[PDB]
Amino acid sequence: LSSAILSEKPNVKWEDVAGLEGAKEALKEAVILPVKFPHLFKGNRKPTSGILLYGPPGTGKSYLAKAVATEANSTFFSVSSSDLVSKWMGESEKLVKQLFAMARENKPSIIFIDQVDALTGTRGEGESEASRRIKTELLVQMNGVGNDSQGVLVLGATNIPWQLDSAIRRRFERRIYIPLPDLAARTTMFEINVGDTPCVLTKEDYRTLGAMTEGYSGSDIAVVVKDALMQPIRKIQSATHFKDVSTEDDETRKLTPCSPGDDGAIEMSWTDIEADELKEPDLTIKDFLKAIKSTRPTVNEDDLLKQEQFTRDFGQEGN
Ligand SMILES: Nc1ncnc2c1ncn2[C@@H]1O[C@H](COP(=O)(O)OP(=O)(O)OP(O)(O)=S)[C@@H](O)[C@H]1O
Ligand SMILES: [Mg+2]
């Protein structure tokens, strides 16, 4: 029981997820509240079996689910609809069945169907017979998740709530919107992503970098920082000259790269430096700007519109 389906006791706390305060809240009421106080839900008030998370690409939907499942001391079982409907097309019902199977045997637990939209785009046989089986098998499995037992909740995710099979949509009672990151979020994300790395920037800087990347998403900023992080490696990769900037207090001499005429520079390469005596240059403001300036926000307003529309026409109620 593996491969196409991922398992784990995930370890992501609400604090690990940047901003999304409103969504985080939503989920506590929808998920943690029933879990922790369970027979608050006697009678006609029953808990939610289906929760969809929609938003534009990169806004934390996957991460937040893990966070949910961790904040609900749960086990996380997750499938990638794309793959499921295109790369595992052979054993899709087998896999869907196995997903729900494994969930129930590991109660309490959460199922994460990513890219729920990838179960539609309908034609005649390829994506409308060879596929519709999967749509059904999932639908059937979920008749069993409002019935059978509830210690198993389905979370679904899309970046395209407007391609979500009508039938499938309705099966997710509660729907929640995961927007692009606010300045606040965007700043903590820059910090989170950089964490330990030796780095010049003060908080105000990050504040500014945040300010400078409005429109960017979670993945976007992640790309940026990843990119930014190779500056030091690249620099270390390509002097020429190194310096011994260790102070009277380092155990060992710390040889950082430097301009070639420059006080104390002696010409070498990284291949000359010993294990203990290398000193990666700190990230610089310029490092980050360079990175940002060669990234473009992945999400454009066209997307956002369709996103807001769905919020309006299906956001809440039914539907
Ligand atoms: N709110 C957040 N807090 C911390 N990291 C985030 C956040 N949002 C996005 N990220 C980062 O961006 C990565 C990709 O985002 P996901 O968590 O996959 O959410 P998503 O909305 O499903 O984005 P995808 O997968 O591109 S559609 C994450 O694994 C994190 O590295
Ligand atoms: Mg995702």
CA dist 46 and 69 (Å) reads: 20
Per the annotation, does 55 bind a ligand?
yes
Residues 93 and 134 sit within 8 Å (Cβ to Cβ): yes
Residue type, 269: S
Measure the CA–CA gap between 99 and 90, rounded to whole angstroms: 15
> What DSSP letter does each residue of 7-21 carry, written as one string?
-------GGGS-S-H
Pocket test for ligand 1, best of 27, 54, 62 (most atoms within 8 A of CB): 62
Instruction: Give the count of beta carbons closer than 10 Å to the beta carbon of residue 211.
Output: 11
Q: Where are the CATH 1.10.8.60 domain residues in the chain? A: 181-297
Atom of ligand 1 nearest to the CA of 115: 27
Phi-psi group of 290: left, alpha or beta (phi > 0 → left; psi -120 to 50 → alpha; rest → beta): alpha
DSSP character for 28?
I
How many whole angstroms separate alpha carbon 113 and alpha carbon 160? 14
Q: CA-CA distance, 255 to 91, in Å (whole number)? A: 56
Task: Return the bridge partners of 174, or none.
Answer: 51
- Are 178 and 54 contacting, i.e. CB atoms less than 8 angstroms apart? yes
151 lines ligand 1 (CB under 6 A): no
Q: Which atom of ligand 1 is nearest to the CA of 59?
A: 21
Nearest to 239 by CA among 221, 218, 264, 216: 264
Please tell me the residue having the least CA distance from ligand 1 atom 23. 58
| Helix 218-228 with 183-194: angle, nearest 10 deg | 40
Return the SS3 of 75. strand
138-164: string of b/e by CB count within 10 Å (b at 16+)? bbebbeebbeeebebbbbbbbbbbeeb
Domain 1-180+298-315 has CATH 3.40.50.1970: no
Residue whose entry in the numeric block shows the structure tokens 């289906």: 50
Cis, bond preceding 106 (omega within 30 deg of 0): no
| DSSP bridge pairs for 199 | 283
The token pair at 183 is: 């300045």
Q: Residue 207: which of 180, 179, 232, 182 has the closest Cα?
A: 182
* Sequence-separated (6 or more) residues with CB below 8 Å from residue 126: none
**Distance between CA atoms of 211 and 229, rounded to whole angstroms?**
20
Q: Say which residues have a Cβ less than 8 Å from residue 129's Cβ, sequence separation at least 6.
A: none
Resolution limit, Å: 3.2
| Cα 266 to ligand 2 centroid, rounded to whole Å | 48
**CB-based burial label for 83 (10 Å; 0-12, 13-18, 19+):** middle
Reference 139, options 162, 169, 112, 115; nearest CA is 169
Elucidation technique? X-ray
Could you tell me the distance, in angstroms and rounded to a whole number, from the CA of residue 236 to the centre of ligand 2?
Answer: 34
Q: Are 180 and 215 in contact (CB under 8 A)?
A: yes
Q: How far apart are CA 233 and CA 35, in angstroms?
A: 46
Cα dist from 234 to 139, 230, 305, 313, whole Å: 51, 6, 40, 50
The long-range contacts involving 197-206, CB below 8 angstroms and separated by at least 24 positions, are 197/229, 197/232, 197/283, 198/232, 198/280, 198/281, 198/282, 198/283, 199/282, 199/283, 200/282, 200/283, 200/284, 200/285, 201/283, 201/285, 201/288, 205/285, 205/288
Q: Report, at the CATH architecture level, how domain 181-297 is classified.
A: Orthogonal Bundle (1.10)
Q: Which amino acid is at 180?
A: L
- Tell me if 58 is assigned to a ligand binding site: yes
Whether residue 218 has its Cβ less than 6 Å from ligand 1: yes
